[PDB]
Design a protein around this nucleic acid. Structure first.
Length: 183
DNA sequence: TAGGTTAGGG
């Protein structure tokens, strides 16, 4: 049994008329659900427009995501890997992005180093190992862009990532303005 | 379209 956090998905843009029952009925098609709930306003019961579903294994979760697009109760919803409450605290933890910031890589890191670790998560479209302007000096970080935002979500939810023989920190990429607006 | 569940008392 893998952690509950990794066996759960956030479902956004849920129809006004979706209830635990209708949600379950749709997602059980891809595996055994251990949890399924529509979040409602703790007072008016009114649906908050989002919920979560949890499967018995992450294999079943992957199957659900490969099943995209998902339409529930006639509305196109948006399934996503569940970000933990703690990580949801971080700036832009819930954005839908295709690029990741990879920090703390050794100087001699080369593109094949990044590929041998990241390719297992999805199709890579771009790889950029950053250097200093005019100096040419390596800056110790890179940006990797995928073809599916889910490749990125599957990555960031993990804690460790080994590249060029050592662990590195990986986070969703924030734009120049998002960064500055986060500090 | 981000949760129904986070710092004691020795």
């Amino acid at each position: 049994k893998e952690p509950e956090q990794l066996r759960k998905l956030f479902i956004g843009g849920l129809s006004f008329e979706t209830t635990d029952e209708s949600l379950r009925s749709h997602f059980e098609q891809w595996g055994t659900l251990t949890d399924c709930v529509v979040m409602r306003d703790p007072n008016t019961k009114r649906s908050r427009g989002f919920g979560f579903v949890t499967y018995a294994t992450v294999e079943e979760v992957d199957a659900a995501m490969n099943a995209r697009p998902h339409k529930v109760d006639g509305r196109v919803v948006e399934p996503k890997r569940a970000v933990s409450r703690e990580d949801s605290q971080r700036p832009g933890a819930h954005l839908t992005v295709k690029k990741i910031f990879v920090g703390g890589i050794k100087e001699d890191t080369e593109e094949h180093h990044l590929r041998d670790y990241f390719e297992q998560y999805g199709k890579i479209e771009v790889i950029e190992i950053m250097t200093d302007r005019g100096s040419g000096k390596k800056r110790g970080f890179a940006f990797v862009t995928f073809d599916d935002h889910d490749s990125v979500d599957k990555i960031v939810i993990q804690k460790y990532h080994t590249v060029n023989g050592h662990n590195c920190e990986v986070r969703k990429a924030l734009s120049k303005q998002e960064m500055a607006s986060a500090s």
